[PDB]
PDB file of C-alpha atoms in Angstrom:
ATOM      1  CA  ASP Z   1      -0.379  40.700  16.713  1.00 13.02           C
ATOM      2  CA  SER Z   2      -1.892  39.462  13.453  1.00 10.89           C
ATOM      3  CA  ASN Z   3       0.702  36.690  13.260  1.00 10.89           C
ATOM      4  CA  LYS Z   4       0.033  35.756  16.885  1.00 12.00           C
ATOM      5  CA  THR Z   5      -3.704  35.638  16.204  1.00 14.05           C
ATOM      6  CA  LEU Z   6      -3.190  33.482  13.118  1.00 11.52           C
ATOM      7  CA  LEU Z   7      -0.734  31.292  15.023  1.00  9.43           C
ATOM      8  CA  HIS Z   8      -3.273  30.789  17.806  1.00  8.45           C
ATOM      9  CA  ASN Z   9      -5.977  29.774  15.337  1.00  7.89           C
ATOM     10  CA  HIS Z  10      -3.546  27.552  13.441  1.00  9.47           C
ATOM     11  CA  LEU Z  11      -2.464  25.910  16.696  1.00 10.61           C
ATOM     12  CA  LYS Z  12      -6.046  25.013  17.592  1.00 12.42           C
ATOM     13  CA  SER Z  13      -6.772  23.760  14.080  1.00 12.03           C
ATOM     14  CA  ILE Z  14      -3.550  21.736  14.060  1.00 15.03           C
ATOM     15  CA  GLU Z  15      -4.489  20.007  17.309  1.00 15.71           C
ATOM     16  CA  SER Z  16      -7.980  19.196  16.046  1.00 16.51           C
ATOM     17  CA  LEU Z  17      -6.618  17.895  12.745  1.00 16.82           C
ATOM     18  CA  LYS Z  18      -4.138  15.639  14.531  1.00 15.99           C
ATOM     19  CA  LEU Z  19      -6.838  14.168  16.763  1.00 15.90           C
ATOM     20  CA  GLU Z  20      -9.126  13.523  13.799  1.00 15.59           C
ATOM     21  CA  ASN Z  21      -6.364  11.809  11.833  1.00 11.68           C
ATOM     22  CA  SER Z  22      -5.454   9.595  14.788  1.00 16.48           C
ATOM     23  CA  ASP Z  23      -9.058   8.489  15.264  1.00 14.85           C
ATOM     24  CA  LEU Z  24      -9.488   7.665  11.582  1.00 12.88           C
ATOM     25  CA  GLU Z  25      -6.218   5.730  11.490  1.00 15.25           C
ATOM     26  CA  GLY Z  26      -7.222   3.649  14.498  1.00 15.28           C
ATOM     27  CA  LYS Z  27     -10.575   2.747  12.996  1.00 17.36           C
ATOM     28  CA  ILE Z  28      -9.037   1.813   9.647  1.00 18.10           C
ATOM     29  CA  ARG Z  29      -6.414  -0.359  11.332  1.00 17.58           C
ATOM     30  CA  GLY Z  30      -9.031  -2.263  13.308  1.00 17.58           C
ATOM     31  CA  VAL Z  31     -11.179  -2.867  10.250  1.00 15.75           C
ATOM     32  CA  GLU Z  32      -8.198  -4.054   8.213  1.00 18.22           C
ATOM     33  CA  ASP Z  33      -7.120  -6.487  10.925  1.00 17.65           C
ATOM     34  CA  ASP Z  34     -10.602  -7.984  11.189  1.00 16.99           C
ATOM     35  CA  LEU Z  35     -10.885  -8.400   7.423  1.00 20.87           C
ATOM     36  CA  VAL Z  36      -7.467 -10.053   7.190  1.00 21.68           C
ATOM     37  CA  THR Z  37      -8.320 -12.486   9.981  1.00 23.77           C
ATOM     38  CA  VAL Z  38     -11.612 -13.475   8.351  1.00 24.19           C
ATOM     39  CA  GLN Z  39      -9.934 -14.003   4.986  1.00 23.93           C
ATOM     40  CA  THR Z  40      -7.193 -16.147   6.517  1.00 24.93           C
ATOM     41  CA  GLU Z  41      -9.739 -18.318   8.319  1.00 23.62           C
ATOM     42  CA  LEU Z  42     -11.737 -18.880   5.136  1.00 21.45           C
ATOM     43  CA  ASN Z  43      -8.618 -19.740   3.143  1.00 23.34           C
ATOM     44  CA  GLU Z  44      -7.441 -22.156   5.832  1.00 24.62           C
ATOM     45  CA  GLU Z  45     -10.779 -23.974   5.835  1.00 22.12           C
ATOM     46  CA  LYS Z  46     -10.777 -24.285   2.049  1.00 18.39           C
ATOM     47  CA  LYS Z  47      -7.197 -25.557   2.022  1.00 20.55           C
ATOM     48  CA  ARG Z  48      -7.994 -28.147   4.687  1.00 20.47           C
ATOM     49  CA  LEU Z  49     -10.985 -29.415   2.712  1.00 19.50           C
TER      50      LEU Z  49
ATOM     51  CA  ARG U   1       6.902 -38.401 -13.028  1.00 19.91           C
ATOM     52  CA  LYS U   2       9.918 -37.432 -10.913  1.00 22.32           C
ATOM     53  CA  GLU U   3      10.750 -34.710 -13.441  1.00 20.63           C
ATOM     54  CA  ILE U   4       7.105 -33.601 -13.284  1.00 19.51           C
ATOM     55  CA  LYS U   5       7.356 -33.397  -9.490  1.00 17.45           C
ATOM     56  CA  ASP U   6      10.482 -31.259  -9.870  1.00 15.03           C
ATOM     57  CA  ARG U   7       8.558 -29.018 -12.277  1.00 15.88           C
ATOM     58  CA  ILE U   8       5.719 -28.812  -9.742  1.00 12.85           C
ATOM     59  CA  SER U   9       8.220 -27.725  -7.087  1.00  7.86           C
ATOM     60  CA  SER U  10       9.532 -25.075  -9.488  1.00  8.64           C
ATOM     61  CA  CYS U  11       5.933 -23.938 -10.021  1.00  4.45           C
ATOM     62  CA  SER U  12       5.400 -23.742  -6.256  1.00  4.16           C
ATOM     63  CA  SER U  13       8.514 -21.563  -5.998  1.00  2.23           C
ATOM     64  CA  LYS U  14       7.251 -19.368  -8.845  1.00  2.00           C
ATOM     65  CA  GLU U  15       3.987 -19.021  -6.909  1.00  4.15           C
ATOM     66  CA  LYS U  16       5.854 -17.561  -3.928  1.00  6.04           C
ATOM     67  CA  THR U  17       7.786 -15.322  -6.325  1.00  6.54           C
ATOM     68  CA  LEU U  18       4.488 -14.068  -7.769  1.00  4.58           C
ATOM     69  CA  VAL U  19       3.118 -13.491  -4.262  1.00  5.67           C
ATOM     70  CA  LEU U  20       6.203 -11.427  -3.409  1.00  3.35           C
ATOM     71  CA  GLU U  21       5.802  -9.476  -6.658  1.00  4.57           C
ATOM     72  CA  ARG U  22       2.151  -8.779  -5.811  1.00  4.96           C
ATOM     73  CA  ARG U  23       3.124  -7.603  -2.323  1.00  5.05           C
ATOM     74  CA  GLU U  24       5.753  -5.300  -3.836  1.00  3.00           C
ATOM     75  CA  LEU U  25       3.165  -3.967  -6.294  1.00  2.53           C
ATOM     76  CA  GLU U  26       0.723  -3.278  -3.450  1.00  4.02           C
ATOM     77  CA  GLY U  27       3.437  -1.466  -1.504  1.00  3.71           C
ATOM     78  CA  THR U  28       4.336   0.584  -4.576  1.00  2.18           C
ATOM     79  CA  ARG U  29       0.663   1.464  -5.078  1.00  2.00           C
ATOM     80  CA  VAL U  30       0.354   2.594  -1.451  1.00  2.00           C
ATOM     81  CA  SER U  31       3.518   4.680  -1.823  1.00  2.00           C
ATOM     82  CA  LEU U  32       2.154   6.196  -5.043  1.00  2.00           C
ATOM     83  CA  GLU U  33      -1.126   7.089  -3.324  1.00  2.00           C
ATOM     84  CA  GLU U  34       0.761   8.740  -0.456  1.00  2.00           C
ATOM     85  CA  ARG U  35       2.946  10.628  -2.941  1.00  4.28           C
ATOM     86  CA  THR U  36      -0.143  11.773  -4.855  1.00  2.22           C
ATOM     87  CA  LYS U  37      -1.739  13.050  -1.641  1.00  2.31           C
ATOM     88  CA  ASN U  38       1.467  14.890  -0.721  1.00  2.95           C
ATOM     89  CA  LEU U  39       1.678  16.341  -4.238  1.00  2.85           C
ATOM     90  CA  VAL U  40      -1.930  17.548  -4.071  1.00  2.00           C
ATOM     91  CA  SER U  41      -1.207  19.220  -0.726  1.00  2.00           C
ATOM     92  CA  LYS U  42       1.958  20.824  -2.121  1.00  2.00           C
ATOM     93  CA  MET U  43       0.083  22.014  -5.220  1.00  2.00           C
ATOM     94  CA  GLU U  44      -2.627  23.611  -3.079  1.00  2.00           C
ATOM     95  CA  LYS U  45       0.038  25.304  -0.948  1.00  2.00           C
ATOM     96  CA  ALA U  46       1.881  26.524  -4.054  1.00  2.00           C
ATOM     97  CA  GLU U  47      -1.343  27.886  -5.555  1.00  2.00           C
ATOM     98  CA  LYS U  48      -2.116  29.752  -2.327  1.00  2.00           C
TER      99      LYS U  48
ATOM    100  CA  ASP E   1      10.262  20.566  -4.103  1.00  2.00           C
ATOM    101  CA  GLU E   2       7.325  20.021  -6.470  1.00  2.00           C
ATOM    102  CA  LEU E   3       9.663  19.205  -9.362  1.00  2.00           C
ATOM    103  CA  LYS E   4      11.499  16.728  -7.128  1.00  2.00           C
ATOM    104  CA  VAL E   5       8.171  15.203  -6.061  1.00  2.00           C
ATOM    105  CA  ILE E   6       7.056  14.967  -9.701  1.00  2.00           C
ATOM    106  CA  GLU E   7      10.291  13.184 -10.608  1.00  2.00           C
ATOM    107  CA  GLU E   8       9.764  10.827  -7.661  1.00  2.00           C
ATOM    108  CA  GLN E   9       6.163  10.211  -8.753  1.00  2.00           C
ATOM    109  CA  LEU E  10       7.306   9.443 -12.302  1.00  2.00           C
ATOM    110  CA  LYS E  11       9.890   7.012 -10.918  1.00  2.00           C
ATOM    111  CA  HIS E  12       7.206   5.408  -8.739  1.00  2.00           C
ATOM    112  CA  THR E  13       4.867   5.090 -11.729  1.00  2.00           C
ATOM    113  CA  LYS E  14       7.657   3.460 -13.743  1.00  2.00           C
ATOM    114  CA  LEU E  15       8.320   1.075 -10.847  1.00  2.00           C
ATOM    115  CA  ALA E  16       4.603   0.259 -10.633  1.00  2.00           C
ATOM    116  CA  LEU E  17       4.506  -0.427 -14.377  1.00  2.00           C
ATOM    117  CA  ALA E  18       7.546  -2.695 -14.024  1.00  2.00           C
ATOM    118  CA  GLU E  19       5.852  -4.491 -11.121  1.00  2.00           C
ATOM    119  CA  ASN E  20       2.695  -4.953 -13.202  1.00  2.00           C
ATOM    120  CA  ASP E  21       4.788  -6.345 -16.063  1.00  2.00           C
ATOM    121  CA  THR E  22       6.504  -8.721 -13.628  1.00  2.00           C
ATOM    122  CA  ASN E  23       3.093  -9.795 -12.311  1.00  2.00           C
ATOM    123  CA  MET E  24       1.888 -10.446 -15.866  1.00  2.00           C
ATOM    124  CA  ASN E  25       5.033 -12.485 -16.544  1.00  2.00           C
ATOM    125  CA  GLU E  26       4.434 -14.440 -13.328  1.00  2.00           C
ATOM    126  CA  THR E  27       0.835 -15.084 -14.400  1.00  2.00           C
ATOM    127  CA  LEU E  28       2.057 -16.344 -17.779  1.00  2.00           C
ATOM    128  CA  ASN E  29       4.551 -18.579 -15.965  1.00  2.00           C
ATOM    129  CA  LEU E  30       1.734 -19.871 -13.745  1.00  2.00           C
ATOM    130  CA  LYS E  31      -0.343 -20.643 -16.841  1.00  2.00           C
ATOM    131  CA  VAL E  32       2.617 -22.492 -18.371  1.00  2.00           C
ATOM    132  CA  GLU E  33       2.981 -24.377 -15.081  1.00  2.00           C
ATOM    133  CA  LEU E  34      -0.714 -25.304 -15.144  1.00  2.00           C
ATOM    134  CA  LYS E  35      -0.267 -26.609 -18.692  1.00  2.00           C
ATOM    135  CA  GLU E  36       2.772 -28.583 -17.513  1.00  2.00           C
ATOM    136  CA  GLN E  37       0.722 -29.987 -14.621  1.00  2.00           C
ATOM    137  CA  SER E  38      -2.015 -31.048 -17.045  1.00  2.00           C
ATOM    138  CA  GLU E  39       0.646 -32.757 -19.166  1.00  2.00           C
ATOM    139  CA  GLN E  40       1.993 -34.398 -15.996  1.00  2.00           C
ATOM    140  CA  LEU E  41      -1.479 -35.693 -15.127  1.00  2.00           C
ATOM    141  CA  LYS E  42      -1.788 -37.065 -18.664  1.00  2.00           C
ATOM    142  CA  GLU E  43       1.616 -38.740 -18.297  1.00  7.20           C
ATOM    143  CA  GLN E  44       0.552 -40.224 -14.951  1.00  8.41           C
ATOM    144  CA  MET E  45      -2.623 -41.596 -16.541  1.00  9.62           C
ATOM    145  CA  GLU E  46      -0.507 -43.073 -19.344  1.00 10.52           C
ATOM    146  CA  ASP E  47       1.815 -44.629 -16.751  1.00  9.54           C
ATOM    147  CA  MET E  48      -1.155 -46.140 -14.907  1.00  9.12           C
ATOM    148  CA  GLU E  49      -2.465 -47.554 -18.192  1.00  6.73           C
TER     149      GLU E  49
ATOM    150  CA  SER X   1     -13.619 -16.312  -4.587  1.00  8.81           C
ATOM    151  CA  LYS X   2     -14.409 -14.340  -1.435  1.00  4.62           C
ATOM    152  CA  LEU X   3     -10.772 -14.599  -0.308  1.00  3.64           C
ATOM    153  CA  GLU X   4      -9.597 -12.484  -3.252  1.00  6.19           C
ATOM    154  CA  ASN X   5     -12.255  -9.852  -2.535  1.00  2.41           C
ATOM    155  CA  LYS X   6     -11.263  -9.786   1.142  1.00  2.00           C
ATOM    156  CA  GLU X   7      -7.595  -9.409   0.177  1.00  4.66           C
ATOM    157  CA  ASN X   8      -8.443  -6.549  -2.193  1.00  5.29           C
ATOM    158  CA  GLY X   9     -10.459  -4.851   0.545  1.00  6.22           C
ATOM    159  CA  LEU X  10      -7.589  -5.271   3.000  1.00  4.36           C
ATOM    160  CA  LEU X  11      -5.170  -3.800   0.449  1.00  5.44           C
ATOM    161  CA  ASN X  12      -7.472  -0.818  -0.117  1.00  7.56           C
ATOM    162  CA  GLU X  13      -7.749  -0.327   3.650  1.00  6.44           C
ATOM    163  CA  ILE X  14      -3.956  -0.487   3.979  1.00  5.50           C
ATOM    164  CA  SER X  15      -3.602   2.113   1.219  1.00  2.34           C
ATOM    165  CA  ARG X  16      -6.123   4.368   2.972  1.00  4.34           C
ATOM    166  CA  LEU X  17      -4.235   3.903   6.248  1.00  6.40           C
ATOM    167  CA  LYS X  18      -0.960   4.821   4.534  1.00  4.00           C
ATOM    168  CA  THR X  19      -2.584   7.946   3.086  1.00  2.27           C
ATOM    169  CA  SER X  20      -3.909   8.845   6.543  1.00  2.00           C
ATOM    170  CA  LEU X  21      -0.440   8.298   8.025  1.00  2.00           C
ATOM    171  CA  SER X  22       1.093  10.582   5.393  1.00  2.00           C
ATOM    172  CA  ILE X  23      -1.560  13.200   6.187  1.00  2.00           C
ATOM    173  CA  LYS X  24      -0.767  12.843   9.896  1.00  2.00           C
ATOM    174  CA  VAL X  25       2.956  13.257   9.206  1.00  2.00           C
ATOM    175  CA  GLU X  26       2.204  16.406   7.202  1.00  2.00           C
ATOM    176  CA  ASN X  27       0.038  17.657  10.078  1.00  2.17           C
ATOM    177  CA  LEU X  28       2.851  16.974  12.558  1.00  2.00           C
ATOM    178  CA  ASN X  29       5.305  18.878  10.356  1.00  2.00           C
ATOM    179  CA  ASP X  30       2.810  21.750  10.175  1.00  2.58           C
ATOM    180  CA  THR X  31       2.432  21.671  13.971  1.00  5.01           C
ATOM    181  CA  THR X  32       6.211  21.829  14.404  1.00  4.05           C
ATOM    182  CA  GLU X  33       6.343  24.766  11.985  1.00  6.69           C
ATOM    183  CA  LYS X  34       3.518  26.411  13.944  1.00  5.24           C
ATOM    184  CA  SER X  35       5.416  25.949  17.213  1.00  2.00           C
ATOM    185  CA  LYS X  36       8.509  27.511  15.635  1.00  2.00           C
ATOM    186  CA  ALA X  37       6.351  30.379  14.359  1.00  2.00           C
ATOM    187  CA  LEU X  38       4.859  30.800  17.842  1.00  2.00           C
ATOM    188  CA  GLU X  39       8.339  31.044  19.363  1.00  2.00           C
ATOM    189  CA  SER X  40       9.279  33.582  16.684  1.00  2.00           C
ATOM    190  CA  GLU X  41       6.061  35.488  17.425  1.00  2.00           C
ATOM    191  CA  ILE X  42       6.862  35.561  21.147  1.00  2.00           C
ATOM    192  CA  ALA X  43      10.307  36.951  20.322  1.00  4.90           C
ATOM    193  CA  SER X  44       8.691  39.490  17.984  1.00  5.18           C
ATOM    194  CA  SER X  45       6.218  40.450  20.723  1.00  5.10           C
ATOM    195  CA  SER X  46       9.089  41.070  23.140  1.00  4.55           C
TER     196      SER X  46
END
């Protein structure tokens, strides 16, 4: 019973954790991409000049 | 001047070599950060 | 597992130190190449003269 | 000079994303262990 109870709780927590992680990852990725793009553009311009 | 142009080409190749070295260093730093996070998690689990 | 992870972390730190040394050597080579390019510009000015 | 700062920020973001991916892999391993423990707990309940 105790184990089951713990398991149940753990299960819920696990799910939540996963979701959170995913969200964070997504956000980070997006940000990174944007930054990279901007940088590239700037560099290109400079080079051209 | 032709020899200087050859040296400039060698310098341009060394620039790409340095860029590859910097990329490898960044990858190694990311791997070290991931390993440190995993080691902190394992240390917390071992303490518990 | 923690001893294995500590050995892996020590190996990764040694690899990072080797990569930093290689980056410093590449920076020294780039400085030598900049000096060679300055000498090449001086030689080109001498050739124009 | 802003290009170097942007590259450093992108590298820091990539390192944070790698740390988050390692944390997510650890969470997935923990979820698999929890599913195995739930199967074992169902067997123990029977």
